[PDB]
Design brief:
Cyclin A, domain 1; mainly alpha; monomer; Transcription elongation factor S-II; 5 helices
């Protein structure tokens, strides 16, 4: 009996950019989570959420698996701030290895396309 308002009043983050469809939610969870955390040791929230929201959003966001997009991003968000997305869906396809090598070692034989 004393908490009727919301809670996102502490962060008070401005968000007017890619917010077009749901990128707002992305730049929001990325900013509000890494921001409120610490303002002295930020890894570069601005430069972080700006360079990440471009991958997990390639084409899986809404017209794909809104179910997975959310889980993947939201849940794995931890690994997102670290490296990237292990292809939440292709994982089973080739998660047994580290695709850190074949990343280009093989496609380098023929990267272009005559």
């Amino acid at each position: 009996g004393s908490h009727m308002p919301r809670n996102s009043k502490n962060d008070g983050v401005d968000t007017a950019i890619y917010h077009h469809k749901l990128r707002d939610q992305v730049l929001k969870a990325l900013y509000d989570v890494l921001a409120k955390e610490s303002e002295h040791p930020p890894q570069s929230i601005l430069h972080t959420a700006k360079a990440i929201e471009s991958e997990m959003n390639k084409v899986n966001n809404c017209d794909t698996n809104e179910a997975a997009y959310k889980a993947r991003y939201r849940i794995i968000y931890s690994n997102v701030i670290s490296k990237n997305n292990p292809d939440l869906k292709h994982k089973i396809a080739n998660g047994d290895i580290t695709p850190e090598f074949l990343a280009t070692c093989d496609a380098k034989d023929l990267a272009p396309a005559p």
